[model samples]
Target: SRVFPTQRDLMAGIVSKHIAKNMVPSFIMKAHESGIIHVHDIDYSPALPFTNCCLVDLKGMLENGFKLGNAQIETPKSIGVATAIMAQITAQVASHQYGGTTFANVDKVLSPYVKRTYAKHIEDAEKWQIADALNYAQSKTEKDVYDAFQAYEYEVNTLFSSNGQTPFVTITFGTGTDWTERMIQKAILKNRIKGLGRDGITPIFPKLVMFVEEGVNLYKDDPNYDIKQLALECASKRMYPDIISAKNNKAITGSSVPVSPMGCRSFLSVWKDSTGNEILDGRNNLGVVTLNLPRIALDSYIGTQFNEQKFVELFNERMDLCFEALMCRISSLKGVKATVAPILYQEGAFGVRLKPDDDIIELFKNGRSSVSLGYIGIHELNILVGRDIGREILTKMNAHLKQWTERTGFAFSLYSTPAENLCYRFCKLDTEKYGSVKDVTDKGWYTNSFHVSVEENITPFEKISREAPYHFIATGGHISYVELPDMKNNLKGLEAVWDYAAQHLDYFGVNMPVDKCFTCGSTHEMTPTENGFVCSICGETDPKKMNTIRRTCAYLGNP
Candidate 1:
C-alpha cells in the first residue's frame, strides 16, 4: 500500500542518482498491466504519436499536392486516371506514422472528378456490364460516374490492404444541398452493394458512415430522401454506413458546423474558421487511454457505506493518473522532426506548416489534435449500482476534462471507447477475483461504452432511446445502434428509425445479419444448406467458403 512514494518524494527521487526506470506511477502501471485500465494504443511508437483517427483532406491533398512541393496530384479526368491518385493518397496516409485513417466527405471530395470523367466517357459508360442500370444511371455522366466510382472504391480498399491485412479505413459522406453531393452519395452506396473483388463478396475497407439531418437529408419531403432509402437498402446487405445526426450532435460538439464519427465512433469536437464555418476535415485524435470502468465500479462498494462520494473521488484520481500516462506519450512525440513526415506536417494532411527543421510538438499543443481519455464497461458499471450511474460519472468527467483543457490548453475529452479487445481482457481479470456474476461478468466479454448488453431483450427503438442521451456526454466519440431484422424489404421501417433518431438522438446506426455467396457472385437473402450459407440468387452452396459480411466495431467483416 505504501509502494508509491508521496508526490513530493517521487519528484525528488527523479533528481537523485537511482532514477526510477519507469516514472509512471506504480499503482497505475500495475492497473494497466492487470487490465484494470487497458492501454489502447500501445502498438504504435511513441516517437511519432498519431491520433486514433485522422479526417484526411482527400480533395485538398489531391489539389496542389496539399501545397507540399513534390506531392502535387494532377487533376484526374477519369476513374482510371483518378484511381492512381486516390491510391497514392491512401498509401501516403498509411505510410505516415498514425494509428488509423478516414476520409471525410469522401463522396463529396471525389465527385467533381467523377462528373468530369462521365462527361468525357459517356460512350464508354454505356457498355458497363451491369445488367440493371435502373439503380445506377444509364445517362451519359451517370453511367460513367458509377463505373468509375466502383473502380475508385475497389482501388482505395485494395491499396490500404497492401500489407495483406486490412488497415482501418473509414469513409464518411452525407447528402449535401447540391447536385454533386447527392450524386456522390448515391454512387458510393451503389458500389458498396455491387461488391468489389472478382468473387463479388463485399469489400472490407472504407467503413462507411452516413451523416443525417432534418431538412438536409432525412425527411421524405427533403431533397435527398431517395439517398437515405438507398443507404437503408445497402445496410440491409452490406451492414454499414452508420447514421450520424448533425443537428443533435451539435449540442454536444458545441457548434452548428458539420461533424462525423471517426471510424467506429470517435467524434471530433467542433472548430470554426474566422467566418464561423465549421471545419470537420483534417482533424484527428492524438491518442487514447481506455479505463476499466467495471473495475472502478466493483471497487466502489467494498463495504457497507457504498459511498457515492468515494466513487467520485476515485474516478477523479484515476482520470488524473490516466492523463499523466497519456502526457508521457505526447512528450515522447514532441521531439520527432517534422521533416520525417513532410506529407503529414509540412504538407496539408495535418496542415501546411512546420519547417523541415521544426519538431511536431507544437501541432498538438495548440489544440489542432488531441489525446483522449476513453472509458469502457459502462454496462457493467451501471449494473453494479442497479441504475444508470454512467451519466453521473461521465458528466463529472466531462467537467474535469473541460477544466483541464483550459488549464493546459490541451484538448482532453471523454471518449466512449470501442473496447474491441478490452472486453475479454477486463472480463478475464474480473472473473479471476469476483468469480462469475450473472449478466455482468458471467460472459467472457464486457460491453463497449454505455451500450445495453447484447443479451438484453431491449427493442431497437428502446435501445436508441436509452443510448441516445449518453452520446452527448461522450464528447470524444460514441455510436448508438439498433439490431434489426432484414431491412431490405422494410425501408419504411428503417426510415421511421432514422427519422426518430434525427428528431431525438445525436447519431445512430443499425446492424442487420447478412450473408453472401462468393462462389457464384450472387448476393441475395441466404438460406442454410448443411453447415454453411446458400445463396438464394443462384442456390450455390459452399459450406466452408460462404462469406457473411456484418458490421462489427464499425467495420465490415467476413468470417
Candidate 2:
C-alpha cells in the first residue's frame, strides 16, 4: 500500500518542468499573425493538436454503451434509436473545440440496425392489416433516418455558439444489401427533395460521400446504377455529396475495409485489425497541426530570388519544431485519468476502454490514434517561387514523415488541411506585414493546397487536370474543386466534371452555387448582381428573402 503526503506535491513531481505556455515559438506565432507563417494552435487546444476533422468509432461507442445526459444507451436496433444515439454523439463531440466528427462506414454500420428495424416494422404492420407493409416499413424507415439527419443538422447549427460553426457529419454510402442500399438511396433521396428543416428548408449537416464501386454504384449497367445516378443528381442539385472512388486502390484495402472519407476531403488509409484484417470503423485521427507553407516559401526567398535550398533548410527547421510540438501535444493527455474522459477512454468511444488502473496514454500511444502533419496555402507556396516546388516538397516530406512513423512506430500522415479560418488569419497577418503581394495575398486570403486561385479564370477541366497530382502527395486528405457559376440544369456537364476528377484525383468535389427564393418558393442557379443575389424567374433581388448555398470546402453552407 502506498500513500502520498499531499496531491499537490505528487502533481508537482509528475509535472517535472512547468510546460512552456506555448509550444510554437513566439516568432512563429507573430509570423502567423503577420501572415508570415501560421502554425495552428495545437499547444492551446485542450486535446493535442491532431486533426481538424475526425472520425470516432461511434458504432463501437454505441455498441458498447455510452452516456447521454444520464441515460446509458445500448446498441441501437433501429434507425430511429440509432440516429437518436448519433445525434447525442454529435452534440457531445461538437462540445470539443476540435474541428468535427465523421461517422466512417456510416451506411455499413447503420444498415444492419435499419434492416432489422425495417423487418420489425413490416412484421408488425402485416399483423395490424397494414397496406403495402414493405413500402410502409421502407417509408417509415426512410422518414426516421431523414428526420434524424435533420435533427442532427439542427442541433449542430443552432445549438453551437459560433455563427457558421456546425458539426461536420459526413455519411458515406457504399455497396450494401436491400436494407443498406435503400438506406443510402433514401438518404440521397432526402437530400434531393425540397426541404426538411425547421422552416421547411434544406437541412445542412451530415454531408454525403458516395463510394464509387465498379459493379456497384459506378456503372450504368450495374444493379445500383439508379443509386449512382441519384447520387450524381443529388450532387448536382445540393452539392453536398462528394464522390470517393473505391476502385482507386490507393486508399482502400479489399471489400473488408469499408472506404469512406472523413468530414470533407480527409480519406483514411486502410488500417488493419490484430488479425491483419482491414478495418475503418471505430477509429479516427487525433487532430491536425496545419503549417502555413506560403509563409515558409516567402520567408525563404531573398528579395525576388527564390532559394530552393534555403527554403528547404528553413522548412526542415520548422518541421522539426512542429514535430517536437506535435509529440508534446500527442503526449499532453498522458497521465490524465480514464475518469477524465470516461466516454472516450473509459467508455468504448475508441475501440477499447481503459481499466480503472490503466493509464489513458496507452490509447494514444497505441496504433489507433494518430497525429497528421497538415499544410495549407499550397497554391500560395507555389506562387512564392517562379517554379512549382510544393508538390515535390510535399512528396518528399511525406516520405520523411513515413520514415519517422516507421522509426518511432507512431502514425505521422501528411495532411492537406482545409485551413478554414487560418486562411483569414494568414491573410490578415500578411496584409498588415507585407502590405500585399499581387495575386498571392492581395485577396486578403490564400487559396488552399495546390488549388488554382478561386479568382482565377480557368476551365473546369483545366483546374481538375492541374490539381490532380497534388492529391497523391497529400496523404492525410486532398480535394480539388472546379468552381461552377451554374450547373443547375446541366447534370451531364456536372457528371463529366465528376468523371474527369474521378479518374484523376483521390477525393473531389464540384462547387456550384444554389439560390432559393423564400417568397416565391423557387430554387435555381443564382445570379450574383451588384446589390446581392437576383432570381431569374420571380425576379426577386432582395437578399433578405433569399438563401444562397455554396460549397466553401468539403461541406455545403448558406451565407
Candidate 3:
C-alpha cells in the first residue's frame, strides 16, 4: 500500500475521469480541467456515493453494539476487546468514505473499558488470595492497557480499505482527568514512541492529536502535565500526536469544548443538538470544492495593478460556480439510504441508527454536516496582487460562504485546503497558459493556503504568528506547520513552539525529517536528489533500499 501509484490506482484514475465527464456539469468540469478550481477526490466522486472526513462516534458504537454485515457485535467487556472493535470500526468507516476518519476523545471513550479490565484483574487477585490485591490489579491493568494499544497500532497500520490503501485514521485524546483515562493516554504515547516492526519504522496511520487545555495539560501545575510531557517526547521522535489548543479552538469555534479535525486539518463547524448540547461525534464533511486563488488573482490582474473591482467580480462569479458544484455533491447524497453504508448510517458508528431503507438527507440539513468551499495558493495570490491582501480575500470568501449557508440551509464553510497534487496541478496549468509570470507561476508548486513561502527564512515563531490568523477564518478546516530540522534532541525548543501554538494557533504540527536506511538499519535525515533520496548515513541511493516519511499535506506518507 505504501508503494506509489499502484496498478489499481492507475486504472481507477482512468475510470474516474471517464465517470466525471459524464456525471459532472460541463462548466464545473471545465473549471477543474482548466485548473481554475480543483474538485478533490474526482477519482472517487461519482463512483463512491459517500461524504468526506468524519469524527466517528466510537464511544456510542462501543456502548450500544453495532452490526457488521449479518453479525451482531455486542459491547466489549474489556480494554483489549474494545480496542480491537475500535480498529474494526475505523477500517469499515474508512472504506465507506474517501477521507480521514477520526476517533475523538479516545482517552475518555476507553476509560470505562480500562476500568472494567482493572476490576476483572482485581477479581483474579482476590480469588488467588494475593496480598496487596489493589496494587497487583493496578499493575496488571497497566500492562494490559499498554499491550492493547500496541495491538491497536498494529491493526491500524495493517488494515486496508476497499481502495487498496491503509485507511486514513486519526485518534484524538488528552484533556481527561480520570486515572484510567491517564493510563490510556500514556500507553498510546509510549507505543507510538516505540514504533513498529523489526526495523522500528514509524506507523503513519492513526494520526495522534493531543489537546492542550490550560488547567488540564498545558502547565506544570496541570493534572495531566505528565501526559503532555510524554506527548512532546513522542512527537519529537515519531512526529505525531499534533497539538490542538483547547483555548484557541474555543475562541475560534465559539464552543467551550475542543474538537478534532477530520483528516489532517479539516475542522468541523460546531453543531448543537435540539437540547443545546455541543456535538463532536458522528459529524462529517459532505465534500470539498477548492478555488484556485492565484488563478483568480491572475484573471483579475491589470497591467499596472490588481484592479480591486475586477477581483471582486471574478471572485463572486467563481464562488457562484463553486456553490453550484458543491450543491451537486450534496445532491448526490440526498437520497442515499442507510443500506449504502450500514456501518455508518444503520450502525452506531455515526452516533445514530436508522432503518435500513431510510434516507440520510436530514443529516445534511440544519448544520448536521458541512460542505467545504476550500481555497489554496493564497501566498501566490498575494504575490501576484503585489500586496498582502490574503486577509481581505479570505474575508470576502467567508462572507460569501456564510450567506450561502443562510440561503441554502447547508453548512457551507471556508476551508484552507491542504492541497497536495492540486498545488502542482494549478501551478502547472497557470504557468503553461500564462508562461511563468515572475514569482507567482515560476515555481514548480504553489504555496498552500495562507502559509509563508517554503523558501522564506523566517523563524518558527514568525511563521506560526504569520499563519495564525487564517486558522480563525478557515473554519471548514485549517492547520499550520513549522518546518524544523531534527528536533529529537531538542525537546525544550519543541515545547516552546508548542507553547506558542497553544497560545496563538488552533491546530499546529512540527515537521522534521524522519528517514531510515533499510540497507544498514540506520536512521538519518536523507537528502533528496533528482532521482530519489540518498540515505545520509549509508549513502544508499536506491529508493527501494531506504525509507523516507514526510508529512504530505496533513498526513504522513512515504516516497
RMSD of each: 7.7, 6.7, 2.2
Q: What number of backbone clashes does candidate 1 have, counting pairs of residues 3 or more apart or in separate chains? A: 3
Q: Is candidate 2 or candidate 3 better by TM-score?
A: 3
User: Clashing pairs in model 3?
Assistant: 267-477
- The TM-score values for the models, in the order shown, are 0.85, 0.87, 0.95
Best by TM-score: 3
Q: Report the lDDT tens digits of candidate 2 across residue range 1-559.
A: 1234334433432443223334445654444445544445433243232234566677788666776556777888877677677767766665443566777766666776777777888888979999988879878877777765555555555544432244566776666546565665557456445454433555576677776667776666867767767766677667657777565535432335545665666656666667886656555665566677777776777877778889879888877765665565566555666655555555655567677567766665545555677777777777787777777878878887877687666678787778777777776766665678877788888777777887778888998899887776776777777887566677777878877777777677777776778778787766777667778778888777777877675456665
In model 2, which range of ten residues has the least summed lDDT?
12-21
Give the CA lDDT, 0 to 100, for residue 536 in model 3: 66
In model 2, the Cα lDDT at residue 234 comes to: 70
Q: Mark the regions of model 3 whose C-alpha exceeds 4 Å error after superposition.
A: 1-6, 9-13, 161-165, 302-305, 517-524, 527-546
Residue lDDT tens for model 1, 106-225 = 667776776666555544445765454433333645656576668767677666434422466677888476665676788789988876665556677777888887786777788887
Q: Which model is ahead, 1 or 2, in terms of lDDT?
A: 1
Encode model 3's per-residue lDDT on 1-559: one tens digit a residue.
5454355765876797798788889999999899988888888776558778898988888888888888999888899999999988877887888888898888999999999999999999979997989999999999999999999998887774344445778898998989999999999999998888866777887889999998998998999999988988888778898999998888887777888888777787778889998887988888899999988988886774788889889888999999989887788776778888999988987778889889887866888888898988888888777779888878988898888899988888988888877888898998878877878878778888888988889999999999999888888788889998877778888899999998998999898888778897776688888888887667888877766889856568786
lDDT of each: 0.70, 0.66, 0.85
Instruction: Give the local distance difference test score of model 3.
Output: 0.85
Where's the lowest-lDDT run of ten residues in candidate 3? 157-166
